[PDB]
């Protein structure tokens, strides 16, 4: 990407409400406010953000070729599975990093964050760049393999520390069906189904769309607050986790942008559309994943993966990855 | 006015349905879940058992299946039931 | 009504956000989402929906004759009392249907559902049909006799099973004053009093009106979710309750439309206005009634009346009665 | 450090004010209501009584007036009060 | 002020949503509704109201001289300290009025109520009168000295009843730093910092501004409900408290308006700007203060100060002080 | 299956962090805070203590520092711990 861009975009986007509200809640939390956005208000912000994202996902699916979406969906899946394996051959193998810890931290970094995706969509709009309106609906095709792969490559490493310790079965369907029932992803699945079959244009332009950026600023405040709380969790686990939490989201994005960029060539996929894939990739599960991984990989230490994903994974894919991969797609615009 | 055991399971939020189903199977009458939190956020079951073998058997199952990787403390009080149809005399008592 | 209408209106209205959100929450619930609209968010949706409905109720009362409203209010009352008696001579008298059960199920079907009424008002607007803006304020004149009649004809059947079992007093004011203090009905009573005496035009057109259909879509999702949960409650009581829950709301509406239609003739009451009476009639208490009936008719089994009213009463007055009684008023429009 | 009874009434949400008023009249010092839920949503009173005749008398009233049509179980623990002005020594204790 | 004004303004403003919602919640509460605005909904209304108030505070600070604001800030402070001392030489000294009680009641009447301030700003807008857009940011310069002075003159009277009873140290920084971390004041501090440094114009005009008067009407309902509950608290303490709760807010305002009016002369401070100072002054802490005073003055009886400030302090600064000090600034407009 | 004390502190909402810190210092294992309310809104600590001298010492500190101006009642039950790693046998028990 252009340095003259990623700098412009960054100091620009750092002054936008979306990012200004992330680092904003990061510093009132750092000054120890007794401020608390109620738990009830942050689950309805997620519902709004995700029905809205899903209503247009579904409304623009009822025109699209379902050939145009073919390649981005398969790349959407292959990243989710790959990212877990990268955490397996490049962090699990370091000292004081229990593999079953890194495999869960890879399953959160493979999994998606809607609030980071949402922060990236209202940036692309805000910056007059356009993207497939079904690009949002890539999100679940990554959120679920990544979680699954982490759970299944975990409950394999432990079935290999079993068969080795003696010489001297994981149900996948239920977890990708549990993943599909999560509130966030269900909010999407409902908005998607509504805009394919019903005609929710009325309530979208009068409710779900007007409030998207306003409730996102709150959610972005929330997510930079809950990003600071989890920082104490990182001292308790290794310090390799801090290096991964920093550089993994800039690596995971490029691998996506590279793959993404196989369709400013192959099937026409937009430069906005690959920015959405790259930013989906870099994001770190935050809310949905940590329960799904507490459950399928229980020996995993939630300081390792909940502290990596929420304290550094999210503030970097919002603060640094959005203005970097908007800036890369933007340099691909010579003359 | 018959006696019974108050088995208390205060453990992690995740387990709610997985422990609620272990209790439902034990032969326990009913239970009461609270939302709680603490250090050492949380959950708390209060289960009243006729036998003490049941209050233990419930505490044994939740600790065999979940307590090597999820946190939580199971303690038993010893109370004394005055009323409740599905427990003390079905009437009066 | 015209078959060519009730079909058009139905497949049309089934694609509107209001109904699309009811059957929408019916199927994500049927797929077992872990989705939950917080209890705090659904009581403020009720407050908004009902202050809004009450602000115009009260704002158009400060012009109206209080003669025009005379006949619809007295029919609004007579249906609430009658419906209870119909449940008494036509369901209480069937086998495995304890009378004190049916009398409570009649008091919920006589009582009103605001969210069904609200779903019917934003349909009439949406379908360019007009109604008295004080038509909303009929709602409490039915919600309270019906509840009262159920409580008082109940605590009579049991005073007759007392005086018979020996041979071989109900305070009404407190219950219609408790009914008046319920949150929903109070929300209305406040919006009504505001728009008669004060001048809340400012905040209505900038807040209570813009969000009415947007918060109603959520409430309609909620109400089709809580409609599926209560379905297990029906297996536990008789199976006559399922036949009543289906056909009673189509009968209760016609008796209202017929009465309603005594004032496209007598006092000028609109075709929109009798659609509001018919839909008020068909609706099934859902939230307000079940506490008021748990209390005055305690021997009543809440599977019989809470499962009848919420699982089938509401999904039918929204799904089938609104497009049927919009379609009847619409056929009364020949040429 | 005087002894007392912990009378627990875990019953239906509706009754809250109707039971809160039965307790207020008994001569009970105070009480603590929680929100709870369970199978066998809910409510839970914890009432500390000086006499056991009072803990019973309270449990007797709530079960005469409400327990033939509303659910709920009244059990008594037996605790031991260390502090509280309106109960143990008004000072120290 | 003109009697022909304060009467006009009053019966006018008593018909505005802001005040109509205060006395509105005062009478549904007086009729004993079972209505409850959830605790979660009233803390997010405070957040919205106070980020909004702070976003323009901060957005108009990035033009202003920081000389224009000099005199109103120092008067903003001197009132907060003075008001406490007035409660000390004029209520603490009356019979059956424990001094440590009056000093806390003075620290709530010195402290600010945002919801009263907010009710006064959307009145000045509504009544086509203009005020410095950083006038909101005076609020914390009074809320904190007043609370501090009450705490410090309290823990002095008790160190004088110690040194007298024998013959026969208060950490200030932590309390003005605790005060700064309160949710409300932090909500402001964040909105202020956002509009000085970042550019939150986008989300302000599309979210925080549209909902300000609509969420304020709810908060004004809330505040007239919680104003009626606390009335039983007044019978339990002296009856001098009722005289103070009535006349203190009309006295505290004039002393501010007089001081305020030293800058329709000295530094140009607007007639709208001194109405904001007078109304900030008259307001009575309500939410923020009572915890900060439960903590630093614990021997204080919360019936004396929480019942004075919330039951009569707030309904008078909204109902009577806003239309009286809008009317005074308005008479200063001859010809 | 070792025995312990259930020290209950049900007191004012304000104190939450000030009492949570008195418990943290006592040498107590952990605790459980609930939200509650009542007459005589509230808070409730449940603290399990090995010694009774600790359950008292905790109850002594909260009542020396806070109970002359804030309300609240500290009562002790006497329970019996079946499981919990940081308390009963670290394993089994
Ligand atoms: Na990802
Ligand atoms: Na009805
Ligand atoms: Na003040």
From Swiss-Prot, chains B, D, F:
It comes from the Bacteria. GO terms for cellular component: plasma membrane-derived thylakoid membrane. InterPro entries: N-reg_PII, N-reg_PII-like_a/b, N-reg_PII/ATP_PRibTrfase_C. It is a peripheral membrane protein. GO terms for biological process: regulation of nitrogen utilization. Pfam families: P-II (PF00543). Keywords: Cell membrane, Membrane, Thylakoid. The keyword Transport does not apply. It is found in: Cellular thylakoid membrane; Cell membrane. One of its GO terms (molecular function) is enzyme regulator activity. SUPFAM superfamilies: GlnB-like. Induction: By limited inorganic carbon availability. This is Membrane-associated protein slr1513. It comes from Synechocystis sp. (strain ATCC 27184 / PCC 6803 / Kazusa).
């Amino acid at each position: 990407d252009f340095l003259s861009n990623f700098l412009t975009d960054f100091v620009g986007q750092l002054q936008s409400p979306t990012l200004a509200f992330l680092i904003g809640g990061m510093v009132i939390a750092a000054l120890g406010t007794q401020l608390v956005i109620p738990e009830a208000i942050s689950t309805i912000i997620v519902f709004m953000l995700l029905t809205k994202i899903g209503l247009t996902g579904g409304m623009a699916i009822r025109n699209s070729n379902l050939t145009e979406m073919l390649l981005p969906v398969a790349f959407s899946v292959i990243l989710g599975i790959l990212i877990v394996f990268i955490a397996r051959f490049t962090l699990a193998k370091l000292p004081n990093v229990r593999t079953v810890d890194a495999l869960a931290t890879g399953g959160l970094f493979g999994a998606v964050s809607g609030s980071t995706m949402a922060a990236a969509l209202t940036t692309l709009e805000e910056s007059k760049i356009s993207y497939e309106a079904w690009a949002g609906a890539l999100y679940p095709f990554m959120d679920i393999p990544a979680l699954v792969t982490a759970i299944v490559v975990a409950n394999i490493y432990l079935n290999k520390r079993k068969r080795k310790s003696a010489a001297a079965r994981v149900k996948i369907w239920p977890i990708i069906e549990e993943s599909l029932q999560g509130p966030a992803l269900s909010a999407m699945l409902l908005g998607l189904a509504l805009g394919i079959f019903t005609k929710p244009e009325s309530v979208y332009e009068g409710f779900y769309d007007p409030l998207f950026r306003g409730l996102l600023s709150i959610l972005m405040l929330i997510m930079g607050m809950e990003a600071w709380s989890r920082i104490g969790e990182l001292r308790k686990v290794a310090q390799w986790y801090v290096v991964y939490s920093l550089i993994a989201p800039i690596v995971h994005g490029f691998i996506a942008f590279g793959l993404g960029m196989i369709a400013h060539y192959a099937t026409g996929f937009s430069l906005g559309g690959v920015v959405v894939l790259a930013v989906i990739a870099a994001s770190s599960s935050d809310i949905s994943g940590p329960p799904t991984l507490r459950a399928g990989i229980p020996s995993a230490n939630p300081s390792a993966y909940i502290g990596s994903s929420t304290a550094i994974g999210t503030p970097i894919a919002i603060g640094v990855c959005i203005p970097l991969f908007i800036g890369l797609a933007q340099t691909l615009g010579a003359g | 006015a018959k006696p019974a055991n108050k088995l208390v399971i205060v453990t992690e939020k995740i387990l709610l349905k997985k422990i609620a189903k272990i209790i439902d199977e034990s032969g326990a009458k009913g239970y009461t879940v609270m939302n709680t939190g603490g250090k050492g956020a949380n959950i708390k079951f209060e289960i009243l058992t006729e036998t003490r073998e049941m209050a233990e058997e419930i505490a044994d199952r939740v600790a065999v299946k979940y307590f090597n990787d999820y946190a939580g403390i199971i303690y038993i009080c010893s109370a004394e039931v005055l009323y409740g149809h599905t427990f003390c005399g079905p009437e009066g008592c």
